[PDB]
Ligand binder design. Structure first.
Ligand SMILES: *[C@H](CS(=O)(=O)c1ccccc1)[C@H](CCc1ccccc1)NC(=O)[C@H](Cc1ccccc1)NC(=O)N1CCN(C)CC1
Length: 221
């Protein structure tokens, strides 16, 4: 595998979005992964509708602004037979009634693939050969809220108790040593003003730091 990967450089990633005052992180992680996979198959990067996921995936177990799972979002897309674009189904950061319109569907999946739980080597393989991967992490510490640059490392992070869904768009390392200061390049959904232009580097190969590889998955297009 390459020593460094950054799918943003290949056009697989849309601009950083902002979930605002709604616990829809899972929806942004899901659309991010689907945007990358749809790009692989069509060569077109189209911003997808998180609102569509928020309003419509309750039957699959999601609770809109009150939390959800990327896996169940992918299941919704499969069962629903499609997902609308952001332009046609705008984000309003509140739970509303499903308004999915088939004519505006621009993405689909037939299910999803789960990365071996807790295996950072497996996650690395997926990121390198598949594209952006949806992941869950423990981002509940104040250190994460205040992240600005460098490699994020929180001694109190849990690899089991996760509370935030984000997107791994690559990996690499700082300094000159390819085997040191390694990190996962993560796209957050708190706007471009947060962290490093909306992104955060999470310590990689540091015993599955913050559970980055505990619940990773990607939609099958
Ligand atoms: C997104 C995380 S966030 O809101 O940006 C946030 C903010 C500050 C610190 C950490 C995280 C949401 C928030 C959900 C929430 C809303 C309101 C009150 C409490 C919580 N979190 C999720 O949706 C997580 C994502 C996830 C995916 C996979 C594995 C582990 C976590 N899921 C979630 O919280 N769920 C799952 C579904 N269930 C019905 C409700 C709770």
């Amino acid at each position: 595998l390459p020593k460094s990967v950054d799918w943003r450089k290949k056009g697989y990633v849309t601009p950083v979005k902002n979930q605002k005052q709604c616990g829809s992180c899972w929806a942004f992680s899901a659309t991010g992964a689907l945007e990358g996979q749809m790009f692989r198959k069509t060569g077109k990067l189209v911003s997808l509708s998180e609102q569509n996921l928020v309003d419509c995936s309750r039957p699959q177990g999601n609770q809109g602004c009150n939390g959800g799972f990327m896996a169940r979002a992918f299941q919704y897309v499969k069962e629903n037979g499609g997902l609308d674009s952001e332009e046609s189904y705008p984000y309003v950061a509140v739970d509303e009634i499903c308004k999915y319109r088939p004519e505006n569907s621009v993405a689909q999946d037939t299910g999803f693939t789960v990365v071996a739980p807790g295996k950072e080597k497996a996650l690395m393989k997926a990121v390198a050969t598949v594209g952006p991967i949806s992941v869950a992490m423990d981002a509940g510490h104040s250190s994460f809220q205040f992240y600005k640059s460098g490699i994020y490392f929180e001694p109190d992070c849990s690899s089991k108790n996760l509370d935030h869904g984000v997107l791994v768009v690559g990996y690499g390392f700082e300094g000159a040593n390819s085997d040191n200061s390694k990190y996962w390049l993560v796209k957050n959904s708190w706007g471009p003003e947060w962290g490093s232009n909306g992104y955060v580097k999470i310590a990689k190969d540091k015993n599955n730091h913050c559970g980055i590889a505990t619940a990773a998955s990607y939609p099958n297009v």
